[PDB]
Amino acid sequence: KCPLMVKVLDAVRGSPAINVAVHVFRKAADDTWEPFASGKTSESGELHGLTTEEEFVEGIYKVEIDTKSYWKALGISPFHEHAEVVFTANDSGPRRYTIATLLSPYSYSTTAVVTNP
Amino acid sequence: KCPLMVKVLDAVRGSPAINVAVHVFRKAADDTWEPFASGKTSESGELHGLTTEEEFVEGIYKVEIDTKSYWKALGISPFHEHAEVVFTANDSGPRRYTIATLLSPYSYSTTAVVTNPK
Ligand SMILES: N[C@@H](Cc1cc(I)c(Oc2cc(I)c(O)c(I)c2)c(I)c1)C(=O)O
Ligand SMILES: N[C@@H](Cc1cc(I)c(Oc2cc(I)c(O)c(I)c2)c(I)c1)C(=O)O
User: Is-annotated flag, keyword Phosphoprotein (chain B)?
Assistant: First the structure.
């Protein structure tokens, strides 16, 4: 059981975006962002096992993807410092969240797939 | 003569996203986000006149678009709290920046168009 999954693709090369740093944060009571989990995407551009059902309670989360580092390593000058995804996790809706982001030097697209499957 | 322009479109209705709130921040000397400019998109889904060439110095800027309020006003409970765009501006001299964002309830796409003053 994996409640939160992250997927990153490269629109320049038509490949998974590998070894991309991802930091997850949870909004705290003082309105500040508290480190929650982190990792680097795998050979398939994915990051799993960030959290468990027990720890993933309702609240506001921020997913930060270090896109600038990724492009620099390819020798490409990017526009964005990073890509950020801020959302509320609600117990009402589906239980699994997939955050998928597509990267270009000057653009990114992000989508969420929320399922019970 | 307008160094920072914001354009927002609606992918569900195929139209400009009107009355969208936009807040711009600049990273301060102490690593905090200081208020820089704000406005609402017009009928054309555009926001102009946020700043001048003079005030828009080199720095790290954050454009925050209030997408949650936009969707809620339409009857939709969207996924994201807001759309945020963070970038370094003018570090090799003055440029003109257009930040364009396309909205759907569970997805958004953002692109930048950067040009060298005419
Ligand atoms: N191995 C993982 C990888 C994976 C997940 C998704 I979700 C996906 O689908 C999209 C579609 C679009 I359009 C995007 O911009 C993006 I990013 C992802 C793709 I490709 C691959 C898995 O299959 O388990
Ligand atoms: N008057 C301003 C307004 C304007 C800018 C852009 I840039 C643009 O083009 C796109 C293309 C895609 I694809 C998008 O998802 C989005 I949002 C905008 C359009 I139409 C209009 C100008 O022309 O200066």
Answer: yes
Q: Which amino acid is at A23?
A: H
Q: Check if A103 contacts B (Cβ < 8 Å).
A: no
- What are the structural domains, with CATH classification, of chain A? 1-117 (2.60.40.180)
Collapse the DSSP code of B67 into the 3-class scheme (helix H, G, I; strand E, B; otherwise coil) and give the result.
helix
Distance from CA of B29 to the nearest CA of A (A): 17
Pairing label, strands A96-104, A4-10: parallel
Residues in chain B: 118
**Is the torsion defined by CA of A89, A93, A97, A99 positive or negative?**
negative
Experimental approach was X-ray
Give the DSSP letter of residue B39.
Answer: E
Best mutation site among A2, A4, A6, A9 for ligand 1 pocket (most ligand atoms within 8 Å of CB): A9
Provide the resolution (angstroms): 1.7
B84 is in an annotated binding site: no
CB of A84 within 6 A of ligand 1: the answer is no
**Helix H segments across chain A?**
67-73
- Rounded Cα distance between A22 and A25, Å, is 10
